[PDB]
């Protein structure tokens, strides 16, 4: 019987730029609440599982521990900043003003939503006045009234700005917090986004199962010195078998012999 099962995978290089969440220092432009496409990179979610220091991270359609198994064409990272009273109401299948009247999410929207404390860093003692609301849709220059002013003072004609009452003094339930949605899309495209695939320590000259980048087999390995360039997989001098296999870290060429 084979002794133990073995998997060997290459070192991780492409880290998702989630660091724009840990080290975000500034707010986005008014037109551009942060909606970014994420592709051609490996998404490391392992830190989020055991971080446990942030307000919420609840996410639906996929079990948390199987993210590395699934592969998606695209990831949309949509980040806003909203107040606390709506944090439990930002969820697929629920109601609300912003989620319904600005951009639609499907009732069974599968994706992963996190809410972040900004109490001691981004909150302002005098109040940050950067928060606006879009309130109305009737059907599928912007004036709050119905009649156009045409540059003439009168009814439904207003002043550019009056001081607005935004204050931090409100209670704990009422501070604003940051919201980020990571949406996974699986569509008709070559698989480019893959989760990190962890490997183990290597043991030689024992009857073992081996799994090299998905290549599964069983046997015991011996070193072969035949001339293969590192990028070479297929060749026809023996024409019969997947002769040799190459570790990603160590470029050594190993052939297999079956056990009893």
């Amino acid at each position, epitope marked *: 019987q084979p002794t133990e099962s073995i998997v060997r995978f290459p070192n991780i290089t492409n880290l998702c730029p989630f660091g724009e969440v840990f080290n975000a220092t500034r707010f986005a432009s008014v037109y551009a609440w942060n909606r970014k496409r994420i592709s051609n990179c490996v998404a490391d979610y392992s830190v989020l599982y055991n971080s446990a220091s942030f307000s919420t991270f609840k996410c639906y359609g996929v079990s948390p521990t199987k993210l590395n198994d699934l592969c998606f064409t695209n990831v949309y990272a949509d980040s806003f900043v909203i107040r606390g*009273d709506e944090v439990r109401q930002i969820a697929p299948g629920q109601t609300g*003003k912003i989620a319904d009247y600005n951009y639609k999410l499907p009732d069974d929207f599968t994706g992963c939503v996190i809410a972040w404390n900004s109490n001691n860093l981004d909150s302002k003692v005098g109040g940050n006045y950067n928060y606006l609301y879009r*309130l*109305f849709r009737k059907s599928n220059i912007y004036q*709050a*009234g119905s009649t156009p002013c045409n540059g003439v003072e009168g009814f*439904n004609c*207003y002043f550019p700005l009056q001081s607005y009452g935004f204050q931090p003094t409100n209670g704990v339930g009422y501070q604003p917090y940051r919201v980020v949605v990571l949406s996974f899309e699986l569509l008709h495209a070559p698989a480019t986004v893959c989760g990190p695939k962890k490997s183990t320590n290597l043991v030689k000259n024992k009857c073992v199962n081996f799994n090299f980048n998905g290549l599964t087999g069983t046997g015991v390995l011996t070193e072969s010195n035949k001339k293969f360039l590192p990028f070479q997989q297929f060749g026809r001098d023996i024409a019969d078998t997947t002769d040799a296999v190459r570790d990603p870290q160590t470029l050594e060429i190993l052939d297999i012999t079956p056990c009893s």
Partner: nanobody
Amino acid sequence: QVQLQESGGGAVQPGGSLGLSCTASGFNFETSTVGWFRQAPGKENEGVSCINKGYEDTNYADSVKGRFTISRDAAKNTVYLQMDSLQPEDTATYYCAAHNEPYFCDYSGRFRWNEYSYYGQGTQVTVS
């Protein structure tokens, strides 16, 4: 925009009655909810009454249940609140308010202070 005018406040003696009136303009509040909120010194802003004229469905705060009656006049386009057996806790400045989304049914009126988008000047009622 929407403009609100409250009137009818004053001084009352406990056991009496008072009549508040809310006049709305800039929007047709005949198929939408309009309500009365209060704020008192040392007390949080609390909604006390609301009426939806679409079927005139009524709601009152638990603190005011069984004591106040709210009605809506289409001909006057106003909201009239009648207060019977007033108590000292009813002494407050009253605001007339409405929901951003106009409702079209028997919806009970929300009495959370966050419920107002446009707000009037308010009228004082002192039960003393």
